[PDB]
Automatic annotation (TrEMBL), chain B:
The protein, known as: VP10
InterPro entries according to UniProt: Seadorna_Vp10
From TrEMBL, chain C:
Stated name of the protein: Vp2
Residues of the full protein shown: 353 to 403 of 955
Species this chain originates from: Banna virus (BAV)
Amino acid sequence: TSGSIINHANNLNKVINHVFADKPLISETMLKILTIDGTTGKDGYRNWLD
Amino acid sequence: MDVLSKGSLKELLAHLEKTPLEEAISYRIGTVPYQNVLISRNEYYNQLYPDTTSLIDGVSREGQRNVNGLIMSIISYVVSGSGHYIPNIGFMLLRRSILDILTKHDTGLVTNNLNYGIIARNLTVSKMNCEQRKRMLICFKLLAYKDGNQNDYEIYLNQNIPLKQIAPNFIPGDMRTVIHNQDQLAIVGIPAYRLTQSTELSIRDDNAKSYKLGYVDWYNSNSFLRERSEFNLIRLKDRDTKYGKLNGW
Amino acid sequence: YRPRRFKEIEHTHGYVYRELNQGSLLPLVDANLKESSSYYFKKLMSSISNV
């Protein structure tokens, strides 16, 4: 509803870390995909959400 | 393959100015068109797949030795990638560019009597796609303005509504119109979808796919010009400049 | 000169603020031909004499 795509994806990763704190592998794996996709910028972040 | 890769009116017209007429004609005898044939398509069927030969396939075919045949071969080269077999035309005509043949009176060819109805019928237009039709309408428009038959071109378009809807908008004598045009005229290119190394049933589709897979090989080969990497190595004459315009336009 | 590789973001979303109009130096050169010529000739010789 509000905010940017970059902020939407970055803050979603933090909540994933908090919700799945018992299994840290989930956040580590998701950030691996974001690192590859995020090099293109806002379009890369949109692809990650897709 | 090079002609089919042009995606804009500027690039297509620039290529036609550079290339000579000998590229439009072919020196292989081929076969005759409008013939019902049985071809072998073993990836799909065991029997022989029926089809009909046409002038739009990418294979060379025997053509008539007249001005009508010469124009059909030029349009076939533009919309299919290969021309027909019309020999002994003469070195005076074969040296000149395809654009000069289409829109210059100095060449000596007489094209006033040409009728667009039979040319479209012979160069089967019910079997073309949107990109192929646009290129043919470009050739018709260039010819019409060469012989002062603009009124006949308009009436022909008004008779055929679908052709009018996709007809490119440019004046053959003005370069500003070519720059502003944003039609997509590319028949081969880098595909967004998944292109595989498989056969197609029709003669037209199989030959078109061969050109498409061929362009991918050429795109990744050493003959392609990557502007972002070696723009300072091209000569100044052939470098891309906005001031650049077609001769006489 | 070796070509410069821009990042992919610069190529799609890159913008530059530049003024593309070139002003002629003729008004100064024509008015003072002797002074303009002497200035540039002396500058070039100081550079060439060091080859």
